[PDB]
Structure formats: C-alpha cells, structure tokens
Design a protein around this nucleic acid. Structure first.
Ligand SMILES: [K+]
Ligand SMILES: [Sm+3]
Ligand SMILES: [Sm+3]
Ligand SMILES: [Sm+3]
Ligand SMILES: [Sm+3]
Length: 341
DNA sequence: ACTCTGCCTCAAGACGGT
DNA sequence: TTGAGGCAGAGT
DNA sequence: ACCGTCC
C-alpha cells in the first residue's frame, strides 16, 4: 500500500472519513479486490492452525469465506462485483523480489520450527507463507459464476480497475483495506465491509474529494505525496516521513521541485529514482474498460452449487442449501428482472 | 520537542446452538 | 498481503 | 455475545 497513509488521513484529514449504518447501503453496488479477500480467508480461517479442507486434501477456506460473506452482503442489498489481479506492472519488480526474498527466509524458518516441534512457531511461519494461488482464484471464480455474482479480470492491478469502475459510476465504491486504491484515484474507498452478523468495526468511507480538500492538494500532488510516504513502485527519500512529506508537497507541489530545493548533503535522493515513472503509473494505470462488461446479479444455480460445494468440497448440505435460498430471496428483493423494449 | 528508522509483537472469518 | 502498535536511539 | 466447530 502506501506507508502511513490511513493514519495520516485520520490525523490531518479526519473529515474524509465517514461512517454509516449497514442499513443505508440497500441497493448499492461495490467493487471488491478479490485477491485480498481470498488472502484474508486463507490467513484467518484455520481450525487447529490448519485450513479447512475436504477429504481429498483440497483447501476450502476461501470458498467458505466467499460463499457466506457474499451472501451476507446480498442480504443487506449490497451488490458486489469481484475484481481479480492480472499481470503486475514492471515497476513492481523490485518490491516483488523483496517479497520472494522474505518468502525464502520464511521457508527456511518454517522447516526448522518443524524439526524442533515448535508447533506454535510453526503456525507463525505457515501463516507468513500463505499465498493466494491461481487455483484459489479459479475456484472462487467458479463459485461466483454458480452464485450468479459477477466478477472481472483486471489487466494489471485489480485496485486500479476498481478505482476505474468507481470513476465511471459503475459501482459506488472500491471495497478494500489497501489505501493505494485512493492513490489510483478512486473517488470512494470503503473499509470493513463484511456485513458480519457480529460486526466488530463500523463501515468506513474515504472520500478522495474530502482528502484533497483537507490537505489542499490536487491529484498529481496527492500521488506525489503517496510516493514520498512509500509505495510498491519506487523508493522514497530517507529521512522524509509523513510529517515532512506533507510539508514539502504543500510547499513545493511536486517531487521535481522538492529535489531542486532539498539539501543534497542532508537529504540525498534515491539513485536513479523512478518517481516519475510511478507517478505515471498511479495516474494512468492499465485498467479494464468499464464500459465493456455490464454488471448483472443473476439467479444462483442451486443444484450445481450443491454438487460443487457439498458433493465435491464437502460443505454441509443443509447450510449450503440454506445459504442459496437466502441468496436467491435477497437478490429478488434488491434486483429488478431484465426488461426488453 | 518533534521526526524518523529499524526493530519488535499482533490481528486478520463465519455458522449455529446456547 | 493489509493494516495496528510499541521501543530505543539518532537526526532535525 | 460466547464458543465449539466448520471442511
Ligand atoms: K522514508
Ligand atoms: Sm496495492
Ligand atoms: Sm493488487
Ligand atoms: Sm472429489
Ligand atoms: Sm478435487
């Protein structure tokens, strides 16, 4: 994401953050970063440190989360479209090499904690090694089809396509925890949208327009600010944190100008800094064409959903069947059948 | 006093019966 | 993966 | 709401 962004917004842009009750969202459409939500289920949904799985050893945590949460959203008249990641931008290569480095380190550690039967430390490294795979994505897509819930494949970053869907008015907001979605220009970001039966946190909306107003920036300058906070796509300036980045952006407006003014002895810039390229990425990312697919929420295929979730994945038939009935009735309540003229 | 860095730990879901 | 925080200790 | 269990 962008290091410190959420906090910075709370501290110096408090009014960009609006809370509303789940009841106010009846009828609203939202774009969800599917990979991130899958990740949250893999990580969270363990029984005895082990994922849920069917008897043939296949993981089912992601299916559990994405079946039941999606239905809860629909019960509240919230209509989600799931967006899946595509090929990462080249600028991300450095950051990805870093990740694989940590994954390598985590693999080593896992192995040892195993030898020393450190079952508690083994659970640590296992979690750290959690990875959303292509099979996880394909299985969720399959599930969503059966559920009648639309999904889209982004050409590159999913959060950029979510942003694009919001700007185009195809959904109300991008539901994600990753603030770089705002950096990609999303007018609205919603966090904590799970529609939990036992809500723990309130539904939050971040309005880009309020953010730009409070900080007194335009979007170019806001992207430059985020770049200075620290993004996945290039280096930041050592010694320049949230407090100073804000001051410098407000004073100088652009990173180029910030370079021309910084004392190169005190604040040397990264070597061959790619800020200009990352700036370009955030403002003009590769995104799907939001005029291309028409989002629709369709009738759930009950019998196939039972064969897949129950027959193959070994979910309780009563729960699944009950889930499908609720989903079907809730769609009926929030959705108009197609009309021809 | 204020800022930042680098180091640490920690959580992260949902259902049904009670 | 995304946050959340805390710590000392060094820089401004 | 708590908590054993889910697959
Ligand atoms: K920095
Ligand atoms: Sm991101
Ligand atoms: Sm992404
Ligand atoms: Sm089978
Ligand atoms: Sm199988």
């Amino acid at each position: 994401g962008i290091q410190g962004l959420a906090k910075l917004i709370a501290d110096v842009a408090p009014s960009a953050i609006r809370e509303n009750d789940i009841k106010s969202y009846f009828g609203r459409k939202v774009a969800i970063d599917a990979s991130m939500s899958i990740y949250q289920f893999l990580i969270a949904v363990r029984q005895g440190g082990d994922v849920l799985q069917n008897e043939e050893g296949e993981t089912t945590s992601h299916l559990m989360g994405m079946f039941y949460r999606t239905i809860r959203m629909m019960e509240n008249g919230i209509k989600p479209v799931y967006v899946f990641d595509g090929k990462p931008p080249q600028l991300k290569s450095g950051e990805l090499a870093k990740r694989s480095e940590r994954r390598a380190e985590a693999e080593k550690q896992l192995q040892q904690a195993q030898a020393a039967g450190a079952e508690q430390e083994v659970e640590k490294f296992t979690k750290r090694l959690v990875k959303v795979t292509k099979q996880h994505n394909d299985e969720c897509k399959h599930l969503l089809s059966l559920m009648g819930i639309p999904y889209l494949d982004a050409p590159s970053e999913a959060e950029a396509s979510c942003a694009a869907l919001v700007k185009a008015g195809k959904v109300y907001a991008a539901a994600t925890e990753d603030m770089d979605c705002l950096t990609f220009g999303s007018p609205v970001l919603m966090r904590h949208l799970t529609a939990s039966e036992a809500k723990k946190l309130p539904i939050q909306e971040f309005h880009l327009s309020r953010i730009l107003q409070e900080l007194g920036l335009n979007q170019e300058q806001f992207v430059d600010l985020c770049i200075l906070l620290g993004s996945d796509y290039c280096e930041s300036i050592r010694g320049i944190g949230p407090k100073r980045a804000v001051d410098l952006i407000q004073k100088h407006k652009s990173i180029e100008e910030i370079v021309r003014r910084l004392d190169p002895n005190k604040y040397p810039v990264p070597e061959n800094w790619l800020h200009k390229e990352a700036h370009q990425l955030f403002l003009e990312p590769e995104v799907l064409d939001p005029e291309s697919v028409e989002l629709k929420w369709s009738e759930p295929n009950e019998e196939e959903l039972i064969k897949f979730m129950c027959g193959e994945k070994q979910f309780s038939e009563e729960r699944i069947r009950s889930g499908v009935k609720r989903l079907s009735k809730s769609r009926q309540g929030s959705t108009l059948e197609v009309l021809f003229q």
